[PDB]
Amino acid sequence: TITANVAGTKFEIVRLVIDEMGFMKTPDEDETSNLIWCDSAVQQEKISELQNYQRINHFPGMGEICRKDFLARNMTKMIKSRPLDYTFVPRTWIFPAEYTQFQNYVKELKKKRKQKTFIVKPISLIRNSQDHLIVQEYIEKPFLMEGYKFDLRIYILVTSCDPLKIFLYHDGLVRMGTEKYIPGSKRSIKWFTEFLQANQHDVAKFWSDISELVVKTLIVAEPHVLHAYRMCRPGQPPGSESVCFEVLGFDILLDRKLKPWLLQINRAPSFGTDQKIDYDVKRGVLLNALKLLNIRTMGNYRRIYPPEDKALLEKYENLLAVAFQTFLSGR
């Protein structure tokens, strides 16, 4: 009998799906359960305590891309190494660290008589301090849905970091604006792709661009995760299955040219269910994730790494080599 500890969640759909999968729920003090689910990120010590048969829904060190500042700092190191591969990230300056660096760019822009809008997050807007802010270039012309600016919440499953295996769910949430955009309603991505089709846009390239965005983003995180995981698990035999898996929420904005931009990654996305769209999408994300783990004592998921394209794998492997190289430089 396969069991599950579900004390770490507050979402019914998590409890529901796990119950539907055939898991037997343990008391909240049982630490020997096959499956361990916790909404928030987990202390690396807890991951170290696990046995090789157990599976927990968090990777140690994934916060290097899940933290907005750590994402920027690592993407910055990467862009200065492989710019032509990482153009999906808006220009970001970490305050109050690169306070001087940001001021110069505005001056250089002022010199060239060019205007640009900037957004500040943990939210406001700026154009023309000494605290932990974060300035970022504002995508001014986003893809509009009936005159509305919308957000893309896509879900990514990472089953292993050694070897790296990444899955992309072919559905998600669309958060349209309340008032029409000038330089809200909730939809599904399946609906949005149907929209793209009717308006004659490349849906295939949409997913293709999204997939490369995710893989290259996790490539940045891979050397941080792989190290940390091996630190937590020095009792894992050479080719033994991963103890960790993750459902990550990628927040993505599309521009007028339908180029996907990465805003942030959430390691603890809400799995609340108030609407039918919320139920169907999030149930499918969780249910198919557990099926793929195959905890035995796919559906709308697509494996984006490793890709079936041999030429693309070579590109990814080259970036991984770069990623691990820059990783050493920082230490």
Cα–Cα distances in Å, from 321 out to 104, 141, 252, 309? 32, 34, 26, 19
Q: Quote the CA–CA distance of 41 and 13 in Å, as a whole number.
A: 18
Going from the C-alpha of 43 to that of each of 3, 58, 77, the distances in angstroms are 22, 10, 26
Could you give the C-alpha distances from 34 to 19, 26, 56, 254, 268, in angstroms and in order? 14, 10, 9, 39, 21
Locate 28 and state its tokens. Answer: 């909240």
Cβ burial, residue 180 (10 Å; 0-12/13-18/19+):
exposed
- How far is it, in rounded angstroms, from Cα 316 to Cα 314? 5
Among the listed residues 7, 53, 10, 11, the one whose alpha carbon sits nearest the alpha carbon of residue 30 = 7
Task: Find the helix or strand (DSSP H, E) in which 156 lies.
Answer: strand 148-161
Give the DSSP letter of residue 294: T
Please provide the distance, in angstroms rounded to a whole number, between the alpha carbons at the two ends of the chain. Answer: 44
Contacts of 291 (CB under 8 A, 6+ apart): 21, 298, 299
Residue 98 CB contacts under 8 Å (≥ 6 apart), including other chains: none
Token pair, residue 116, equals 């640009």
**Nearest Cα to Cα of residue 184 among 232, 223, 158, 145:** 145
Resolution (angstroms) stands at 2.6
Would residue 80 be called left, alpha or beta, if left means φ above 0 and alpha means ψ between -120 and 50 degrees?
A: alpha
Whole-number Å distance between alpha carbons of 90 and 71: 11
Instruction: Name which of 75, 51, 55 is nearest 65 in CA terms.
Output: 75
Breakpoints of the chain, after residues (C–N > 2.5 Å)? 122, 128, 183, 297
| Cα pseudo-dihedral 37, 40, 44, 48, rounded to 10 | -10
What letter does residue 72 receive in the DSSP assignment?
Answer: H
The answer to whether 134 and 68 are in contact (CB under 8 A) is yes
User: Whole-angstrom Cα distance, residue 86 to residue 259?
Assistant: 12
Q: Can you say how many angstroms the Cα of residue 131 is from the centroid of all Cα atoms in its chain?
A: 26
Distance CA(117)–CA(135), nearest Å, equals 10
Query: Which secondary-structure segment (H or E) carries 197?
Result: helix 189-198
Number of H helices, E strands in the chain: 9, 15
Q: How far apart are CA 148 and CA 182, in angstroms?
A: 9
Backbone conformation region of residue 288, classed left if phi is above 0, alpha if psi is from -120 to 50, else beta: alpha
What 3-state DSSP class applies to 188?
strand
Q: Cα–Cα distance between 25 and 122 in angstroms, integer? A: 38
Rounded CA gap, 308 and 68, in Å?
31
Angstrom distance (rounded) from CA 259 to CA 92: 18
Supply φ then ψ for residue 272, to 5 degrees.
-65, 155
Query: What is 63-89+141-330's CATH number, 3.30.470.20, 3.40.640.10, 1.10.730.10, 1.10.150.20?
Result: 3.30.470.20
With contact defined as beta carbons under 8 Å apart, do 135 and 93 qualify? yes
CA atoms within 13 A on the CB side of 259: 10
Asked whether 57 and 289 are in contact (CB, 8 A), the reply is: no
Which residue in 259, 38, 246, 275 sits closest to 173, CA to CA? 275
Residue indicated by tokens 């893809």 = 143
Altogether, the residues listed in the chain come to a count of 331
7: Cα separation from own chain's centroid:
24
Rounded Cα gap, residues 308 and 125, in angstroms: 42
Cβ atoms of 92 and 146 closer than 8 Å: no
Q: What three-state secondary structure class fits 260? A: strand
- CATH 3.30.470.20 residue ranges of the chain are 63-89+141-330
Contact between 265 and 65 under an 8 Å Cβ cutoff? The reply is yes
- What percent helix, strand, coil does the chain show, rounded to 5? 35, 25, 40
Tokens 């796919």 found at:
298
Q: Answer yes or no: are the C-beta atoms of 129 and 99 closer than 8 Å.
A: yes
Amino acid of residue 259: K
What's the rounded Cα separation, in Å, for the pair 220 and 68? Answer: 14
Residue 54 makes CB contacts below 8 A (sequence gap 6+) with 32, 33, 34, 35, 36, 243
